[PDB]
C-alpha cells in the first residue's frame, strides 16, 4: 500500500522522538523514519537536533550512512 510519512512533527510524534528514540541502542534516519512514520529528511533533522543537544552519541558519519547510539 501507499506510504504516507509525516513531513513536519506533530505533538505525539515529537513526544515519541524525545522519549523513546534516545534509548534505541541503534539510531539511524531510516530506522527512525520507519518506526515513527517520518520522512528521511525530517528524521535527519531531528537526529541532528538531538546530537546538538547532546542526548545521543555519534559513531560514524558518512554521506551514505550516519550512525547514532544512546548515551552510556
Amino acid at each position: 500500500d501507499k506510504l504516507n510519512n509525516l513531513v513536519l512533527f506533530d505533538k505525539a510524534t515529537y513526544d515519541k522522538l524525545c522519549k523513546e528514540v534516545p534509548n534505541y541502542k541503534l539510531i539511524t534516519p531510516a530506522v527512525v523514519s520507519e518506526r515513527l512514520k517520518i520522512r528521511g529528511s525530517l528524521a535527519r533533522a531531528a537526529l541532528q537536533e538531538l546530537l546538538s543537544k547532546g542526548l545521543i552519541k555519534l559513531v560514524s558519519k558518512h554521506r551514505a550512512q550516519v550512525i547514532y547510539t544512546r548515551n552510556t
Partner: protein, 143 residues
Amino acid sequence: LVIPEKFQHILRVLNTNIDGRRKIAFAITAIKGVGRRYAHVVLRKADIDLTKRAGELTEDEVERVITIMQNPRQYKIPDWFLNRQKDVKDGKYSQVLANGLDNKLREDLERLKKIRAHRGLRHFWGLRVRGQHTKTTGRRGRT
C-alpha cells in the same frame, strides 16, 4: 521542526493544486509552464528561503511569488529564460502558463493547419513531425 499552526496542506495557485508537503522549489513546478530552472530563478528573485515547505509560506510570500512569476521582465529575468520569446502574432516576450499554454499550443497548431504547411498536415494526420523514421517505431497508439 513542529508543524506551524497555520499550515496549508493544499494551495490553490493559478487554477492549479499545489501540494503543501513538497519543498517550495519543486512544489510550484506542478503549474504547467514552470520547470525546475524557472521555479528556482523565480524563488531566488523573490528572496524566499528554499529550505521550507510550500505550506509554511505566508500569504504575502505567495502573492509576491505569483506576481514575480506573472511578469518576469519587470524583475530582471532575462529574455532567453522565457519560453515564448518573440511571438509571431504580436512580437512580445513573455512566459506562458497553465491555460495560456494550452490555448497557445492550439493556436500554433491551427496556424500551421490553416496555411496547409507540411508540419500542420503531419499534425493533422497524427504522424511524426521532426523527420523521424516511422517504419519500425511509433506503433503504440495505432490500431
